[PDB]
Amino acid sequence: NIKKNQVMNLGPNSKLLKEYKSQLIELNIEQFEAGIGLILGDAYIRSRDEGKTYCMQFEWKNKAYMDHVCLLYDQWVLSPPHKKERVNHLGNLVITWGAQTFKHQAFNKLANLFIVNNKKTIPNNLVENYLTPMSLAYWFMDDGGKWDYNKNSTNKSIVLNTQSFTFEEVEYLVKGLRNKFQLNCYVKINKNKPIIYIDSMSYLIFYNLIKPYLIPQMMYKLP
DNA sequence: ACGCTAGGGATAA
DNA sequence: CAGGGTAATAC
DNA sequence: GTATTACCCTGTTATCCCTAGCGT
Ligand SMILES: [Ca+2]
Ligand SMILES: [Ca+2]
Ligand SMILES: [Ca+2]
């Protein structure tokens, strides 16, 4: 069987590469569960055909996290992250790291979880039926944060920046989180957009759910 | 005075 | 976060 | 020549974070 090391430098159309990809059939349990959090989060799952295959594109500032993810999707990621250095309209230099997996049908499973009546969206029962503590941990490392950033604060309330979703979508996410994890949470507004507020009352619950998956360089997001 | 909000910005998506 | 562009293989 | 496609690249902001100042 073809070893990843054997094709991680060939052309995208290489014969050996495709043979390699045919050795792979599906994502494992982690890759899938974390996948859910990443898609709700900062990851991007796209298809260049009509849905035959999907790949995942990653871009984050924190390099340590970018590596944790790549290492997680190891078999699916041929190259190390690429340093991206761009200039703003201001003339400032912003640095970030890029990376992605190759396309493969094994990714369709994750993608279809976010497809209804043929349009990307947030299904009503996504939380209840698929979001696991691992998924939640990754959603947090991506869009999570504190409610109160003031110095010397004691409020343990957490937040999930769901600003790119519609209020209806977030309302369903909230319902799922309350029912499945008994989390005391509710939608709030920021920039006239949806964010999830999780009362400090449930911090300890929330924390123990995701603690097994967060990494050191992400612990700063917690109160 | 000060804990807490919601307002707001230069990124980090 | 989304999509766009292409150097590298295949036939 | 035409089909493929992973690894960059660019277009654009909704992001997460900070903090002015409201309410008490
Ligand atoms: Ca995000
Ligand atoms: Ca993030
Ligand atoms: Ca965004």
DSSP codes of every residue in A191-211: TTEEEEEE-GGGHHHHHHHHT
Judge if the beta carbon of A42 is closer than 7 A to nucleic acid strand C.
yes
**Is-contact A35 A74, C-beta < 8 A?**
no
**Is-contact A114 A122, C-beta < 8 A?**
yes
Domains of chain A from N-terminus onward:
1-120 (3.10.28.10), 121-223 (3.10.28.10)
Give this entry's resolution in angstroms: 2.3
Contacts of A173 (CB under 8 A, 6+ apart): A40, A122, A126, A127, A162, A165, A196
Q: What is the dihedral of CA A171, A173, A174, A175, to 10 degrees?
A: 90
Judge if the beta carbon of A45 is closer than 7 A to nucleic acid strand D.
no
Contacts of A171 (CB under 8 A, 6+ apart): A187
Strand A158-160, strand A144-146: pairing: antiparallel
Return the number of other C-beta atoms located less than 10 Å from residue A7's C-beta.
19
Residues forming a β-bridge with A195 = A188
| Radius of gyration, alpha carbons of chain A | 19
**Is-contact A147 A159, C-beta < 8 A?**
yes
3-class secondary-structure state, position A145: strand
| Length A11 CA → D24 C1' (Å) | 67
Distance CA A48, CA A160 (A): 29
Distance CA A70, CA A131 (A): 21
Task: List, as own/partner pairs, every contact residues A111-114 make where C-beta atoms lie below 8 angstroms and the sequence separation is at least 24, other chains included.
Answer: A111/A45, A111/A47, A111/A51, A111/A54, A113/A36, A113/A39, A114/A39, A114/A45
| Length A182 CA → C1 C1' (Å) | 30
Q: Which nucleotide in the DNA or RNA is closest to residue A164, CA to C1'?
A: D14
- Tally the residues of chain A: 223
Judge if the beta carbon of A201 is closer than 7 A to nucleic acid strand B.
no
